[model samples]
Target: YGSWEIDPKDLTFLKELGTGQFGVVKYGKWRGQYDVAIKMIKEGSMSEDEFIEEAKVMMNLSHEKLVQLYGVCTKQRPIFIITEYMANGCLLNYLREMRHRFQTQQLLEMCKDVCEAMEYLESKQFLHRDLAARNCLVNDQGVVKVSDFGLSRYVLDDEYTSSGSKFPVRWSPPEVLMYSKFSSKSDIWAFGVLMWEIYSLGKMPYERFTNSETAEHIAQGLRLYRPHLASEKVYTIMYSCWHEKADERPTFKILLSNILDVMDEE
Candidate 1:
């Protein structure tokens, strides 16, 4: 593998970045010179076996618009997984915090960045089970990169219960809501919601509805309406991703081309 077996001694922790269900992400320096983000996994937050598989999948993925895994410190307890340090933080916060700053073109560019990454994953036969703006990071240059691939497999608790829903209801399609069935097409559905997030400046999907309510709406053929910031062409592309039938959904490759086509017209 291209990933390094990072020595703990070379890692120096700085300020905390963010916390997830499984770990704390921190801004850190590796080997005294390189800036990096470190994911310090909590001792009992996840299954080691699932983590090992996640690590294997992440280490093999390398793309400009996807966060790159730099190394891992597995010899020690509470594993410290290293990757590229994103200065602007998650795309969700960036959009909300800088609400009025982005131009329509800039918003489309962000979608293009994510679409490129998803196309790469689609080509590799990988499914990003959790695809959302919150799971995407914005680097210092304002480029968006997809993060936390296959992370849904790591959950092992009540997070899956209480509602019998294991996935994010707002982003899931009928098959996923009904049967937890996931495929590349399911990822396409999530990507559509993500585009809606970008155009809405990070508003939560189906904002006023509860999870069950959202699930009910999805089952009834109700799709997200066009964002005020989106053009008719842009909304058309977003709408195509939510076809009720999985096979009816366009692939990431098709989505990317359509996004570029819209970009070209702008």
Candidate 2:
């Protein structure tokens, strides 16, 4: 996987966009032309050089519904992780702010956008590992793109379990919670929770359950209730992603086509 080595001098940092676990994200210009979001990695957040090397694989991923990783500035002290500038920011905030503005059609389109992106990754034998509304970005055109495909591995400040491991338990499946089994199937399970998030207009999933309780319930065959905004057809797709057995879940290909069918009827 090849990558672009961005020069720090060429990047013109602008106003602060936001900050997440990695550190501050700034809206910036690359080469005085292309708009980019530069993520300034905090000191000691992670092993810098190693992360930059692993990030090279992300450059090889190309799809319209995925946030493009333009390059990285590795020579500097606070390394900059550059990516396509998303004007509207992450979907979690967008959905929460917009609220009732999104109709059924618009919501389903957003789901389709993420699903199409995931289908492409599946074809390339890539696992998203982290799939959630918070990880999806929205452009000015209102199109959603799956972001941080493989970038979760570098996040070091999350809640850790007794084994000193961390995952978004509310979005994870029984296999991942019990045995750390990560695969396309686990991503599918996360996608289901994401769909529920979308339909709920960004409400917290499993509002009553703690991460530990969520782990227990999922292991006991409990599934998320249908979101009020989701139709029976839409709920069917979401439910399919939560099948207990990994093999029982539909592939992204199957999910994509099934969603397309629902869209066709609208």
Candidate 3:
């Protein structure tokens, strides 16, 4: 309905880039111009309102650390979200493919990118809801971009609740797991979990436990512990984010400052 109409034949689809519950992503070229990654959202999983909201959010957000949304094609048989191509792919894939641990400086750079994007979103009164290493993309020069806004929600004055809480327990704050309400504070909690993932070289959060088990662990005041070998500073930041009390978690600005401090010390 907007500037996103595309002729299926004009695009040359390359190999599959990624896949998720929503749909498949493919590497493609549009009219022989810039390389683009197209997300073909599966039909019927998302309602019209949901699609429109997602598109609006993507289009409105403009931050260097955040992925750039080119446009959307709702007229296609399957909805297509055109976005800038990330050459190095997601942080998750990078970690898995690399044979050794990443340098501490590298991790800090990634954390900085995430915090910058998150700070922008918080300023706009939005919560990512799901922030993990997998959702972050790194370019060839090591620049990072926060992505995967499918689980994001624009914060309103009133609290809201829905069903998606069970699946993301590892990345969810304790309050969100126990109660459905979420705010920027809860986003801080997820950001802490993400930091752990980065420091641990992308190890799965709450590994060896089922989702429910992880929730129960958190509800009982047990936080996902940092590995014994993790740097003391890293451990400290993780603990601050996982504080049993939600209000104690630092804001993204403070967190970003702390991360930068840690980087300087390293």
Choose the strongest candidate by lDDT.
1
Candidate 3 structure quality by residue, lDDT tens digits, 131-246: 88878888777788989754444222122224243356788877777777678888888888888888777789888998878888988888878764468897787778888778
lDDT per residue for candidate 1 within 199-234, as digits (tens), equals 999999999998989999999999889999999999
State the lDDT of candidate 2 residue by residue for 28-134, as single tens digits: 88888889999898887876766887777777889999898888888777888888999999899999996448889999999999999999999999988889999
Q: What TM-score does structure 1 among the candidates reach?
A: 0.94
- Superposing all C-alpha atoms, what RMSD in Å does each candidate have to the true structure? 1.9, 2.0, 3.9
Stretches > 4 Å off in candidate 3: 1-10, 150-166
TM-score of each: 0.94, 0.94, 0.88
Q: Local distance difference test, per candidate?
A: 0.88, 0.87, 0.77
Error of 3 at 116 (Å): 0.9
Clashes of each: 0, 0, 0
